[PDB]
């Protein structure tokens, strides 16, 4: 959005047209509106206390009332209400998306789920509407969660490879940094998840052993060829030609 077409290199212009064509063709493969991609990619979150998000606040407030930090993990405690209000099927997915929102460091304040419960833990009294200092920072965090679950729904990736992606983003081609290299909700780190999920769906039945062999560093060409019904020497020679 920031770059202008009034002055642009022809190579850069070519590359920009290729990016638009790649994104457009990928959306024609995914059958998505551009509004879907914009809503799943926006960093601007709206600041409005809705009664539904307030119902989420009331349910989590009554739910995680009577909590101590040193008894158990905060994330595992909040995970069922998040799994229900965001309609998530599993509980490890609700674990995943909370670790994800921790990694991305969302809207305005450098904020935390421990900061989230320290807000509901220090400054909260429900069924009362008076504004504190941190409320917009909380509700845009809630909008960020509601955004990041939508790409999990629309992508169709399975759960184990999703754990692998969040836990090791660098092995999926992001530049490395130990548990700080965070993929955003930008479109280039959507299309690569989508391609990886489509590869896993192309595999299908033999997916669990080959994904856990990819999870270890012992994945070979020969196990990989058998899941594609291809001759292994083809993959061997393709690797040699890339080398």
């Amino acid at each position: 959005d920031k770059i202008n077409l009034y002055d642009i290199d022809d190579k850069e212009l070519e590359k920009l047209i290729n990016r638009l064509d790649t994104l457009s063709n990928w959306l024609h493969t995914q059958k998505w509106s551009i509004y879907q991609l914009f809503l799943m990619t926006t960093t601007n979150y709206d600041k409005t206390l809705t009664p539904e998000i307030q119902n989420l606040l009331d349910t989590v407030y009554n739910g995680l009332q009577n909590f101590d930090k040193n008894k158990t993990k905060l994330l595992a405690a909040i995970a069922p209400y998040i799994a229900a209000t965001l309609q998530l099927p599993s509980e490890n997915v609700a674990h995943s998306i909370l670790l994800w929102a921790d990694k991305i460091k969302p809207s305005e304040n450098k904020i935390t789920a421990e900061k989230f419960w320290i807000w509901l833990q220090n400054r909260d009294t429900t069924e009362l509407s008076k504004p504190p200092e941190m409320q917009e920072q909380i509700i845009q965090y809630c909008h960020c969660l509601a955004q990041l679950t939508m790409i999990y729904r629309s992508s169709g990736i399975n759960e184990n490879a999703f754990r692998l992606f969040i836990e090791k983003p660098t092995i999926f081609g992001i530049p490395d940094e130990p548990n700080k290299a965070t993929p955003a909700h930008n479109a280039p780190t959507l299309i690569i998840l989508t391609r990886f999920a489509n590869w896993v769906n192309s595999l299908g039945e033999k997916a669990s052993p080959i994904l856990t062999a990819f999870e270890n560093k012992t994945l070979t060409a020969e196990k990989l060829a058998n899941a594609m019904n291809l001759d292994a020497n083809l993959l061997e020679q393709a690797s040699i030609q890339a080398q």
Binding site: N55, D58, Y61, N62, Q65, N66, T126
Partner: protein, 145 residues
Amino acid sequence: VARCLMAEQAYRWETNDSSARFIKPGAWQGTYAGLLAGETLMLNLAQMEDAHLKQEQRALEVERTVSLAQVYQSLGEKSFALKDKIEALLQGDKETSAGNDGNQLKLTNNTLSATLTLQDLKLKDDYPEEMQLGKTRRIKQISVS
């Protein structure tokens, strides 16, 4: 909810903690027609009973006899023997009453009252304070002979 609050008051009077509360609001959800209250109340009763089982102990049960003749006799120097003074105060129809701030023995209209204050028993000090034994000291039963 009324009976669970009755039980919470019984817990707050058995063990001594007034600030400790267990029954929290929000068990009724009117926007969902109040489904699932039994779960919340059963869980909260379980938390009360488990907190009781944690705070349950073995009690030390000590009896002690208080003879009022010794009590009204052993006082400050405004003291008196119980038998003769009660005999004189009931014999005479006078204003007269014997005792002090906590231990006056007074005749109102019909009745005779011999009252007593709990400091004069010094009954905590029958033992050393010795918090390995205990601090809080509550009456089980008072019986009169």
